[PDB]
């Protein structure tokens, strides 16, 4: 795993934000 899921996902959301 959940950990490593929370990463890939939040990272994809900053991704976005920016973009």
Do not use: Q
């Not at 795993?1 to 973009?19: E, F, T």
């Amino acid at each position: 795993a959940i950990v490593a899921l929370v990463v890939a996902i939040i990272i994809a959301i900053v991704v976005w934000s920016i973009v």
